[PDB]
Amino acid sequence: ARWFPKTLPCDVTLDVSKNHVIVDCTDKHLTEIPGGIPTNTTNLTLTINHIPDISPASFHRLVHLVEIDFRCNCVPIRLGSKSNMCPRRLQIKPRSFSGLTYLKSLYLDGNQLLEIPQGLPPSLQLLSLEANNIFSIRKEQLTELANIEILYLGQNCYYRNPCYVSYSIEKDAFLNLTKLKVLSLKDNNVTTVPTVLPSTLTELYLYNNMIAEIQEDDFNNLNQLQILDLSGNCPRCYNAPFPCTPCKNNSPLQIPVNAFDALTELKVLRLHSNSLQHVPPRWFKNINNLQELDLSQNFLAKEIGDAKFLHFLPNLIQLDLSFNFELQVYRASMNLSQAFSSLKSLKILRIRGYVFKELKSFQLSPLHNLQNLEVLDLGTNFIKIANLSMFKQFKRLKVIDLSVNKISPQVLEQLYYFRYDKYARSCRFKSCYKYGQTLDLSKNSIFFIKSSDFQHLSFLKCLNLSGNLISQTLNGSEFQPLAELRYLDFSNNRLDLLHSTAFEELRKLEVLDISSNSHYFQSEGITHMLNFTKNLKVLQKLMMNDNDISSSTSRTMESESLRTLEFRGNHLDVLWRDGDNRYLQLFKNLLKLEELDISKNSLSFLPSGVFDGMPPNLKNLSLAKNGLKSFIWEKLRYLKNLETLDLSHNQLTTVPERLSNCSRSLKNLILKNNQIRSLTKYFLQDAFQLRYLDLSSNKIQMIQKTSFPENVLNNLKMLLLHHNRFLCTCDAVWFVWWVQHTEVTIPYLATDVTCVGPGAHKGQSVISLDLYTCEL
Amino acid sequence: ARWFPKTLPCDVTLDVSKNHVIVDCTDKHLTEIPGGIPTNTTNLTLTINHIPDISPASFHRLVHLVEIDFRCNCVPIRLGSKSNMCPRRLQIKPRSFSGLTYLKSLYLDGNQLLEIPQGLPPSLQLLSLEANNIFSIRKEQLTELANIEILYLGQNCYYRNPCYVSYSIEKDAFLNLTKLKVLSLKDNNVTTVPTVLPSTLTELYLYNNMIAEIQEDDFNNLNQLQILDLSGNCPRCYNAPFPCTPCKNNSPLQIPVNAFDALTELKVLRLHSNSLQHVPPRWFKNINNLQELDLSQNFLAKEIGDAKFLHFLPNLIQLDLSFNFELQVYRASMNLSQAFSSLKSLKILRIRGYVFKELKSFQLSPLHNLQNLEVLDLGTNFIKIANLSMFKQFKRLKVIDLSVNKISPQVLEQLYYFRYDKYARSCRSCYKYGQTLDLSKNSIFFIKSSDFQHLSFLKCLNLSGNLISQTLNGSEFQPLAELRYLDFSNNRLDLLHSTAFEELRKLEVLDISSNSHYFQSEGITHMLNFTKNLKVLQKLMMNDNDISSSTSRTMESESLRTLEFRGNHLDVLWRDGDNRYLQLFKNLLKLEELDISKNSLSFLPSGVFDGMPPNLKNLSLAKNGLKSFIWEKLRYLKNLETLDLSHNQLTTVPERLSNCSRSLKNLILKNNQIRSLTKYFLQDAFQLRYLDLSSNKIQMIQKTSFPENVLNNLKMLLLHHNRFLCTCDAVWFVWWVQHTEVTIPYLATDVTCVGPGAHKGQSVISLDLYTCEL
RNA sequence: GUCCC
RNA sequence: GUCCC
Ligand SMILES: *[C@@H]1O[C@H](CO)[C@@H](O[C@@H]2O[C@H](CO)[C@@H](O)[C@H](O)[C@H]2NC(C)=O)[C@H](O)[C@H]1NC(C)=O
Ligand SMILES: *[C@@H]1O[C@H](CO)[C@@H](O[C@@H]2O[C@H](CO)[C@@H](O)[C@H](O)[C@H]2NC(C)=O)[C@H](O)[C@H]1NC(C)=O
Ligand SMILES: Nc1nc(=O)c2ncn([C@@H]3O[C@H](CO)[C@H]4OP(=O)(O)O[C@H]43)c2[nH]1
Ligand SMILES: Nc1nc(=O)c2ncn([C@@H]3O[C@H](CO)[C@H]4OP(=O)(O)O[C@H]43)c2[nH]1
Ligand SMILES: *[C@@H]1O[C@H](CO)[C@@H](O)[C@H](O)[C@H]1NC(C)=O
Ligand SMILES: *[C@@H]1O[C@H](CO)[C@@H](O)[C@H](O)[C@H]1NC(C)=O
Ligand SMILES: *[C@@H]1O[C@H](CO)[C@@H](O)[C@H](O)[C@H]1NC(C)=O
Ligand SMILES: *[C@@H]1O[C@H](CO)[C@@H](O)[C@H](O)[C@H]1NC(C)=O
Ligand SMILES: *[C@@H]1O[C@H](CO)[C@@H](O)[C@H](O)[C@H]1NC(C)=O
Ligand SMILES: *[C@@H]1O[C@H](CO)[C@@H](O)[C@H](O)[C@H]1NC(C)=O
Ligand SMILES: *[C@@H]1O[C@H](CO)[C@@H](O)[C@H](O)[C@H]1NC(C)=O
Ligand SMILES: *[C@@H]1O[C@H](CO)[C@@H](O)[C@H](O)[C@H]1NC(C)=O
Ligand SMILES: *[C@@H]1O[C@H](CO)[C@@H](O)[C@H](O)[C@H]1NC(C)=O
Ligand SMILES: *[C@@H]1O[C@H](CO)[C@@H](O)[C@H](O)[C@H]1NC(C)=O
Ligand SMILES: *[C@@H]1O[C@H](CO)[C@@H](O)[C@H](O)[C@H]1NC(C)=O
Ligand SMILES: *[C@@H]1O[C@H](CO)[C@@H](O)[C@H](O)[C@H]1NC(C)=O
Ligand SMILES: *[C@@H]1O[C@H](CO)[C@@H](O)[C@H](O)[C@H]1NC(C)=O
């Protein structure tokens, strides 16, 4: 098809509408800028490479560039690879950028630069120098940036990238940048708010610094500011997972009552880890529009019970008072001030880490009349006692989150309140809530449940009981009131499936997760009824992964409704022991089942009967990670609606003589990570239904035309070949040609479609291989 | 050293004292008997190979053979590999064995044989034909076995190896085998006890068959029999994990009351899975010496509460009544008959699977006066309630086993009572600390001191696999003043308090592995410094705890010798830039063994080694995805003897190992990405004794890297599964490997050339390189 | 590759 | 390969 092979080791995309030519060279182990980058190129990314220098030749031809992303070509020693340390900082020669008349955005983060690069064109709206070694800002070095709007200078002096001094900012350094909207000086060892900043600021990031005091006029002129983050100045250091130095005498960040008076526009204020003991209402006298307030990781436990400042926050959407507990105090209860009632607009309230023994209904009354409240997060509070029925007054809420507590009778990262910098950029780039009302009781100490535990909660759509201690012979009496429940996450418990009536009271249940309930499945002689499915009339999806199931009293699972079954990490090798026919029809009576996952079941072979016993509408089958050493391909004939076969991470050595003759229906075939050395002569002949084919990470040496007829290849959405053992002799002439000239999408042509030999061409990409010597 | 390279792909061992020459060819992907087997060869093993035939040429020279082990060269379809199925049964030509005048033992199990091989010498004392296809025994075929003593015929007709008919045994087939001691007809589809058997039998195995009835005189003459197993004839099939066909009418195996009268010598009687409802005392009227009785997997729940037969068993060492519960009955308590008191000799009692709600002290009184009782096993009973204090009356017992129950306020295989055949042949723990109370796999959520009142004598407590979610503060085990071993694994330790466990003042070993729960949620306080309070602790296991944070910065002990810290997140604690935890193990002054494998340590920040306590001998950094390693830093570890760096991504070795560590004896670098050795790698590294470089990508090895004055001290040197290039540059290496004394495993199997083309796939032991010397 | 798996 | 890990 193609007349001129694409040899450039970068992805190239046309966005014809927005007039853009996008060249992505992210992570291509480059040591030079590749030649032949299109002249029409507008967005060029060279992130994560080892190009040691930039020069006028770097971009000479590329006069249409609006964005260069040149991050992490020399990342500071402690942030970067220890196996591929950068030897010497990126060198930028003069005039490298002054040519680029249309350049709007320049990223040079993570290059060990000592100074703000000079000679930048006046077109530049965005400059980014995170994780460099620039810790002294001077007015003179900034004059070139007159039209700059966004400026990132953070992560240039902190514990992962130390500069061993205080950050220096000359007086009025930023004042003449009259268009500057966004200024980020986070994670920098700054000692004072730099002044005077231009009144044109919308966003100021000053977090994770050594600022002890805000002067009353530090933000005098900033009438346009929308976001201010002063977090992690005088930090709360208890249980900090980074080196943390508090302000002396447990001082807080000192903020004058009138510091915020100019900030009429402020929408987000962030005062996380500022060791605050008081929130003066006077702060918010002229901020009527504040929406998001973060007061997590302070010492505001007392204040939570007073909190006059809330009376001045009627438009607040989001409030975070997480982790304000006094060290070595375990409060009997939660004292929320009446003031919380004045938060007419509040959608999201979070108070993790108040740390209290017992939660009672009336303690939450300050919230009864917040009409817009969607999320209430009382996680990580070590609550021992809580009558769940209290939440009957909270039908309107989308999520009630009591995760990580000690109870017995819109998602946040695993590390969140204790990350150093949760917004920090990586070198790459730049859940049942949807079912309805969700009660998250995950990670508590619930050993035993009964119906009255759930009295008055019939409105729930999702209950999360993951990671409790539930060890009970559920018999269908325990969840009686949960008439609306669509989703139950019962993972990481100790289900005892003695009774086939387990869960049958949850009459509207669409999804059940009983994964990682392996305990009782590990002791011989225990009765388990896997036939419990029959009683669940609307169940769509069952997850029973990592249950180590090696026995069952019942011989068949039954459902008229079940569409998907995850059965990963069990012992079907033991149930289907060769010679024992009793369980070969375990899934057969799941008549509507379309998706089945029996990966990680130690199936080194499949006894005959397995495929005949599969239910008739099976579409999507995974046998991945089974250590399969053999596979009778013909047996795929029984699976008449099979569309996806995942056989990844096994030990298969062969493909079928003709895939067409094994399955007419099969569209996606995944054989990545096997031991295939060669393909059958007529492998894909007449396999007209085939659309996707992964042969990556095998040991294939040759591919001949017969195996891969073009009337199949040209239907394929994707064909993966990378990481094989290709031999680039004159016998590979067809394959090499076809790869060079095909339209078919083949990932990693630049990176890992490589010759292993013969010696001469070893390690050389096949896309670049010249084989003319074979045609004399 | 060696003048004639060993080219035979079999291990060869001299036992000079017993006059034996042992050749082991087990599992060497052979398709022929190798030539050059020594003539003096006495024991020859060819197990697990693909040799398709035996012939007079097979052993022609080997006239001094006493044992041929030729198992599993053609295993039946369903027992064998499905990826390397055997195409056609083993063919044994006539005269193959008649040469072998001294042959005592012959194993031909697992070869798909259709008939008992003929032509066997009269010297033969043991013949073994398990897992063949021989399901009709004829007197005529056995005449050749006149001097036979041990004869295995089992596993020739059962569900893994079906023959599709009943087993046939001609009348008196075994009678004229006048020396036969041991006969095994297990797992065979036998319908009746074959008669008449020779009176010379000591052991008869008839289990897992289709025997419905014992005739009163089936065992008439067997006055010498010691072991009888009739198990799995009319099996109890509830929750059986194999195809199980009960006798119709829920009938038991029918045993007439006088069936055993001749068996004065019987020591072991095994009646497991015989669907027995009664044990008539009359059975044991003439057996006073019975020692071991298995009555597991019957329906003897009622009988347990009567059990007059025990009055006739004063010499019984071992009794098993496990799994006798009536289906869908959950008894309130255990009714043991008074009769149990008469078992003066009983060392071991097992009653799993009685299935009852509550155990009370007095229910065990029938046992109070059994002086010799060592083991009491009440596992898998779904016991809801048990006052542990009752065991105060049982100080004398070595093990009290309450494992797999439902309690809250030798070792047996994982599958045991429900295996088909627990004795079946393959083709190839805190008990020792003293009194042990095994409470593993219960539902204990909360513990307090009174739970252990009166149990001060305990040496081992196993709480593994409970629900313990408690901020242990050192008050909970107060009474356990003697406890040497605590297994607290698979719980949910909340290490808030650094006084946890401190009351266990005699504790030598603590396992708190797989207590990861509270370690997975940010902002929770954990005191890893709890070790300080544990004055005699030798060994601490805290594996698979996913530990990524700690309030305290150092662990302290004067006593601790071994710390297992596998499966945690030291990569997070030691984040580059954060110096605070680099001395976590430094103050464990007597620590000799440390395991920090599986901690995702892709690199070691500088200071890790300086922070290691001074007497560290044995260090594992396996399975960390290490891509780089500053070998010089090994200088800090002055008493280092073992470094395990297996399963990582290392690409190089140090320029001189001698200049990194003088002390290092064992260096394990298996499963890395090493492509070459440094020029003078091992020069002067005289202390080195073990070196694993297996599963790397090494191409060449030169004499400079591997000087002979080091190599020849090595106990073991592993090289297998590398990328060796067998050009004329490899002349030295190839020569040295061929001629060295040094032990190198897998020379026959996986020390292979990958090239050049010509020599590809060829073993280096067999490589001829004369073309290099013209 | 006789039991485990 | 800046937050993670
Ligand atoms: C942040 O700046 C402080 C001081 O402003 C730096 O600390 C000084 O650094 C040197 C080397 O550690 C010491 O000898 C001085 O004693 C320090 N002075 C003070 C007052 O602490 C600190 O290193 C900087 N932090 C980072 C991570 O670069
Ligand atoms: C044990 O022997 C029985 C006969 O007692 C075998 O069962 C016969 O085999 C075929 C095929 O299964 C049936 O059509 C016959 O009717 C069976 N006969 C009877 C009397 O049932 C059985 O297959 C043998 N067992 C094994 C494991 O090989
Ligand atoms: N799984 C299970 N959990 C229990 O808590 C229980 N109590 C009695 N039983 C009985 O134990 C036998 C083996 O588990 C089961 O068979 P059953 O007699 O129907 O009744 C069962 C229990 N089984
Ligand atoms: N680990 C833990 N388990 C608890 O049960 C508990 N109750 C209160 N707390 C307090 O929560 C804080 C963070 O875990 C701990 O710090 P503390 O204030 O010393 O007291 C602790 C508990 N901590
Ligand atoms: C291309 O660059 C412009 C300006 O830097 C930017 O707004 C646009 O999103 C970029 N797109 C891509 C895909 O790089
Ligand atoms: C709650 O806290 C406030 C402010 O600290 C305190 O004054 C008040 O007495 C407390 N009220 C209750 C109900 O505990
Ligand atoms: C929980 O509170 C409800 C009121 O919603 C009440 O009916 C129920 O009895 C309470 N349960 C307990 C143990 O207090
Ligand atoms: C339940 O909570 C657990 C642990 O907090 C989390 O992994 C899981 O995603 C939650 N389940 C659902 C369905 O959202
Ligand atoms: C379940 O247990 C309840 C009470 O806990 C008992 O009353 C009943 O037998 C069981 N119900 C069903 C539907 O099996
Ligand atoms: C499940 O199987 C058992 C037999 O093992 C049967 O008694 C029970 O009622 C079955 N349950 C259903 C829902 O079919
Ligand atoms: C098939 O199922 C897997 C999970 O088992 C899923 O990730 C994949 O997207 C599915 N594909 C199709 C085409 O149904
Ligand atoms: C496979 O191929 C043969 C010959 O073309 C044909 O007879 C047979 O029906 C085919 N089976 C399928 C399922 O295509
Ligand atoms: C060698 O064969 C004899 C006879 O079968 C036996 O007693 C001895 O234990 C065997 N030794 C080995 C090492 O096979
Ligand atoms: C357990 O038994 C002991 C005596 O062995 C008694 O002192 C204690 O009170 C008992 N505990 C209970 C709850 O019965
Ligand atoms: C404790 O019991 C567990 C769980 O059954 C068992 O695996 C372990 O070996 C026992 N502990 C010790 C130290 O013997
Ligand atoms: C531990 O807690 C118990 C109560 O459960 C308390 O009585 C005891 O004094 C505490 N011990 C220590 C060492 O703090
Ligand atoms: C452990 O360290 C903590 C402070 O981090 C301290 O409270 C406690 O005294 C220490 N405990 C021991 C036993 O050293």
Rounded to an integer, what distance in angstroms lies between the CA atom of residue A198 and that of residue B131? 89
Counting ligands in written order, which one lies closest to the CA of residue A307?
6
Q: Residue A90 is encoded by which pair of tokens?
A: 């990126």
Q: What is the CA radius of gyration of chain A?
A: 31
Instruction: Using DSSP, state whether B110 is helix, strand or coil.
Output: coil
Cβ neighbours, 10 Å, residue B352: 25
The answer to whether B684 is a known ligand-binding residue is no
Closest residue in A to B552 (Cα–Cα): A239
Cα distances (Å, whole numbers) of residue A127 to A92, A148, A185, A332, B710: 15, 8, 13, 52, 59
Cβ partners under 8 Å of residue A457, min gap 6? A388, A389, A391, A392, A439, A481, A482
Closest C-alpha among A180, A188, A170 to residue A132: A188
**C-beta of residue A201 within 8 angstroms of C-beta of residue A244:** no
Closest residue in A to B160 (Cα–Cα): A579
**C-beta of residue A190 within 8 angstroms of C-beta of residue A209:** yes
The number of CA neighbours under 13 Å toward the Cβ of B563 is: 26
**C-beta of residue B110 within 8 angstroms of C-beta of residue B90:** no
Rounded to an integer, what distance in angstroms lies between the CA atom of residue B674 and that of residue A756? 18
Alpha carbon A676 to chain centroid, angstroms = 33
Which residues are paired to A692 by β-bridges?
Answer: A668, A718
Residue spans of beta strands (DSSP E) within A408-546: 438-440, 462-464, 487-489, 511-513, 541-543
Q: Residue A54 is encoded by which pair of tokens?
A: 């930039």
Mutate to test the pocket of ligand 8, among A380, A432, A442 (most ligand atoms within 8 A of CB): A442
Closest chain A C-alpha to B602 CA, distance in angstroms: 8
Q: What angle do CA B620, B621, B622 make, to 5 degrees?
A: 95
Given CA atoms A27, A33, A36, A38 in this order, what sign does their dihedral have? positive
Residues in chain B: 774
**C-beta of residue B443 within 8 angstroms of C-beta of residue B466:** yes
Long-range pairs, B100-104, Cβ under 8 A, ≥24: B100/B59, B100/B62, B100/B63, B100/B65, B100/B68, B101/B63, B102/B63, B102/B64, B102/B65, B102/B66, B103/B65, B103/B66, B103/B67, B103/B68, B104/B66, B104/B67
The answer to whether A440 is a known ligand-binding residue is no
Cα distances (Å, whole numbers) of residue A696 to A654, A670, A674, A675, B730: 14, 9, 9, 10, 34
Rounded to an integer, what distance in angstroms lies between the CA atom of residue A598 and that of residue A429? 34
Cβ partners under 8 Å of residue A297, min gap 6? A235, A236, A272, A273, A322, A323, A324, A417
Instruction: Using DSSP, state whether A537 is helix, strand or coil.
Output: coil
Phi, psi of A145 (to 5 degrees): -95, 30
Q: What is the CA radius of gyration of chain B?
A: 32
Residues with CB under 7 A from strand C: A 550, 571, 573-574, 577, 602, 604; B 48, 50, 71-72, 75, 79-81, 84, 107, 109-110, 128, 130-131, 154-155, 160, 241-242, 413-415, 419-422, 424-428
Closest C-alpha among A530, A532, A571, A533 to residue A552: A530
Rounded to an integer, what distance in angstroms lies between the CA atom of residue B557 and that of residue B417? 44
DSSP A561-604: S--EEE--SS-HHHHT-TT--TTTTSSTEETT--EEE--SS--S
Q: Are β-strands B53-54 and B67-69 bridged in parallel, bridged antiparallel, or unpaired?
A: unpaired
CA of B348 to the centre of ligand 14 (A): 27
Cα distances (Å, whole numbers) of residue B380 to A346, B130, B161, B384: 54, 33, 32, 11
CA of A165 to the centre of ligand 1 (A): 5
Cα distances (Å, whole numbers) of residue B322 to B40, B240, B361: 51, 15, 20
Burial of A380 (0-12, 13-18, 19+ CB in 10 A): buried
B438: which chain A residues are within 8 Å (Cβ-Cβ)? none
**C-beta of residue B685 within 8 angstroms of C-beta of residue B715:** no
Cβ neighbours, 10 Å, residue B705: 19
B424 — alpha (psi -120 to 50), left (phi > 0) or beta? beta
Closest C-alpha among B247, B308, B291 to residue B273: B247
Rounded to an integer, what distance in angstroms lies between the CA atom of residue A696 and that of residue A750? 15
Rounded to an integer, what distance in angstroms lies between the CA atom of residue B138 and that of residue B115? 10
CA of B403 to the centre of ligand 15 (A): 9
Given CA atoms A30, A31, A35, A38 in this order, what sign does their dihedral have? positive
What residue type is assigned to position A715 of the chain? N
Q: Residue B208 is encoded by which pair of tokens?
A: 């897992």
Q: Residue A413 is encoded by which pair of tokens?
A: 């990262």
Cβ neighbours, 10 Å, residue A717: 12
Q: Are β-strands A105-107 and A126-128 bridged in parallel, bridged antiparallel, or unpaired?
A: parallel
**C-beta of residue A482 within 8 angstroms of C-beta of residue A510:** no
Contact flag A380-B521 (C-beta cutoff 8 Å): yes
Contact flag B418-A582 (C-beta cutoff 8 Å): no
A763 — alpha (psi -120 to 50), left (phi > 0) or beta? left
Rounded to an integer, what distance in angstroms lies between the CA atom of residue A304 and that of residue A306? 6
Burial of A428 (0-12, 13-18, 19+ CB in 10 A): exposed
Q: Residue A740 is encoded by which pair of tokens?
A: 């060079």
Judge if the upstream peptide bond of residue A16 is cis by omega within 30 degrees of 0. no
B441 — alpha (psi -120 to 50), left (phi > 0) or beta? left
Secondary structure of B636-693 as H, E, C letters = HCCCCCEEECCCCCCCCCCCCCCCCCCCCCEEECCCCCCCCCCCCCCCCCCCCCEEEC
The answer to whether B406 is a known ligand-binding residue is yes
Phi, psi of A53 (to 5 degrees): -160, 150
CB nearest to A243's CB, from B525, B578, B602: B578
The secondary structure of residue A161, as a DSSP letter, is B
Secondary structure of B342-375 as H, E, C letters = HCCCCCEEECCCCCECEECHHHHHHHCCCCCCCE
The number of CA neighbours under 13 Å toward the Cβ of B325 is: 25
What residue type is assigned to position A698 of the chain? N
B647 — alpha (psi -120 to 50), left (phi > 0) or beta? left
Instruction: Using DSSP, state whether A436 is helix, strand or coil.
Output: coil
Cα distances (Å, whole numbers) of residue A768 to A6, A747, A748, A758: 9, 15, 13, 15
Cβ partners under 8 Å of residue B35, min gap 6? none
Q: Residue A604 is encoded by which pair of tokens?
A: 């080194």
Instruction: Using DSSP, state whether A475 is helix, strand or coil.
Output: coil
- DSSP3 helix / strand / coil % (chain A, rounded to 5): 15, 15, 70
Closest residue in B to A631 (Cα–Cα): B83
Q: Are β-strands B587-588 and B593-595 bridged in parallel, bridged antiparallel, or unpaired?
A: unpaired
Judge if the upstream peptide bond of residue A758 is cis by omega within 30 degrees of 0. yes
Long-range pairs, B123-127, Cβ under 8 A, ≥24: B123/B147, B124/B148, B125/B149, B125/B150, B126/B150, B126/B151, B127/B151, B127/B152
Burial of B761 (0-12, 13-18, 19+ CB in 10 A): exposed
For A100-125, b/e burial (b = at least 16 CB within 10 A) is beebbbbbbbbbbbeebbeebbeebb
Phi, psi of A277 (to 5 degrees): -110, -20
Rounded to an integer, what distance in angstroms lies between the CA atom of residue A497 and that of residue A508? 20
Rounded to an integer, what distance in angstroms lies between the CA atom of residue A388 and that of residue A404? 15
Contact flag A417-B522 (C-beta cutoff 8 Å): yes
Rounded to an integer, what distance in angstroms lies between the CA atom of residue A16 and that of residue A2? 20
- State in Å, rounded, how far the first CA of chain A is from the last one: 24
**C-beta of residue B430 within 8 angstroms of C-beta of residue B485:** yes
**C-beta of residue A579 within 8 angstroms of C-beta of residue B160:** yes
Cβ partners under 8 Å of residue A754, min gap 6? A726, A763, A764, A765, A766
Q: What angle do CA B40, B43, B45 make, to 5 degrees?
A: 125
| Tokens 């004072």, located at residue | A192
Which resolution, in Å, applies to this structure?
2.5
Cα distances (Å, whole numbers) of residue B160 to A383, B244, B420: 55, 12, 11
Rounded to an integer, what distance in angstroms lies between the CA atom of residue A3 and that of residue A772? 16
**C-beta of residue A111 within 8 angstroms of C-beta of residue A70:** yes
Please name the nucleotide lying closest to A573, CA to C1'.
C5
Closest C-alpha among A155, A428, A413 to residue B577: A155
Judge if the upstream peptide bond of residue B756 is cis by omega within 30 degrees of 0. yes
Q: Residue B25 CA to D1 C1' — how many Å?
A: 51
The answer to whether A39 is a known ligand-binding residue is no
CB nearest to A525's CB, from B160, B239, B242: B239
DSSP A280-320: -GGGGSS-----EEE--SSS-HHHHTT-GGGGG-TT--EEE
Rounded to an integer, what distance in angstroms lies between the CA atom of residue B661 and that of residue B231? 60
**C-beta of residue B345 within 8 angstroms of C-beta of residue B409:** no
Instruction: Using DSSP, state whether A115 is helix, strand or coil.
Output: coil
Q: Residue B316 is encoded by which pair of tokens?
A: 């019984």
- DSSP3 helix / strand / coil % (chain B, rounded to 5): 10, 15, 70
Rounded to an integer, what distance in angstroms lies between the CA atom of residue B229 and that of residue A341? 79
**C-beta of residue B577 within 8 angstroms of C-beta of residue B602:** no
**C-beta of residue A503 within 8 angstroms of C-beta of residue A496:** no
User: Is the distance between the Cβ of A415 and the closest atom of strand D smaller than 7 Å?
Assistant: yes
Cα distances (Å, whole numbers) of residue A490 to A133, B132, B490, B579: 50, 48, 19, 40
Which bases of chain C are under 7 A from a protein CB atom? 1-5
B415 — alpha (psi -120 to 50), left (phi > 0) or beta? beta
Rounded to an integer, what distance in angstroms lies between the CA atom of residue A529 and that of residue A520? 12
Contact flag A323-B602 (C-beta cutoff 8 Å): no
Long-range pairs, B290-294, Cβ under 8 A, ≥24: B290/B266, B290/B315, B290/B316, B291/B267, B291/B315, B291/B316, B291/B317, B291/B318, B291/B345, B292/B267, B292/B268, B292/B316, B292/B317, B292/B318, B293/B268, B293/B269, B293/B318, B293/B319, B293/B320, B294/B231, B294/B269, B294/B270, B294/B320
Burial of A337 (0-12, 13-18, 19+ CB in 10 A): middle
Rounded to an integer, what distance in angstroms lies between the CA atom of residue A172 and that of residue A221? 13
Rounded to an integer, what distance in angstroms lies between the CA atom of residue A241 and that of residue A237? 9
Burial of A18 (0-12, 13-18, 19+ CB in 10 A): exposed
Q: Residue B761 is encoded by which pair of tokens?
A: 């796939």
Instruction: Using DSSP, state whether B151 is helix, strand or coil.
Output: strand
Q: Are β-strands A462-464 and A487-489 bridged in parallel, bridged antiparallel, or unpaired?
A: parallel
Rounded to an integer, what distance in angstroms lies between the CA atom of residue A49 and that of residue A70? 9
Q: Are β-strands B509-511 and B539-541 bridged in parallel, bridged antiparallel, or unpaired?
A: parallel
**C-beta of residue B424 within 8 angstroms of C-beta of residue B397:** no
Closest residue in B to A407 (Cα–Cα): B469
Instruction: Using DSSP, state whether B735 is helix, strand or coil.
Output: helix
Residues in chain A: 776
Instruction: Using DSSP, state whether B758 is helix, strand or coil.
Output: helix
DSSP B390-435: GGGGGTT-SEEE--S------PPPSS-TT-S-TTPPP----GGGS-
Give the domains, in start order, of chain B with CATH numbers: 1-774 (3.80.10.10)
The secondary structure of residue A542, as a DSSP letter, is E
Rounded to an integer, what distance in angstroms lies between the CA atom of residue A513 and that of residue A508? 15
| Tokens 């100021």, located at residue | A204
Cα distances (Å, whole numbers) of residue B188 to B130, B209, B246, B428, B504: 10, 6, 16, 22, 54
Mutate to test the pocket of ligand 4, among B496, B547, B551 (most ligand atoms within 8 A of CB): B496
Rounded to an integer, what distance in angstroms lies between the CA atom of residue A30 and that of residue A46? 9
Rounded to an integer, what distance in angstroms lies between the CA atom of residue A266 and that of residue A201? 11
Given CA atoms B138, B143, B146, B152 in this order, what sign does their dihedral have? negative
Cβ partners under 8 Å of residue B412, min gap 6? none
For B404-429, b/e burial (b = at least 16 CB within 10 A) is bbbbbeeeeeebebbebbeeebebee
Instruction: Using DSSP, state whether A643 is helix, strand or coil.
Output: coil
Given CA atoms A130, A133, A138, A140 in this order, what sign does their dihedral have? negative
Alpha carbon B54 to chain centroid, angstroms = 33
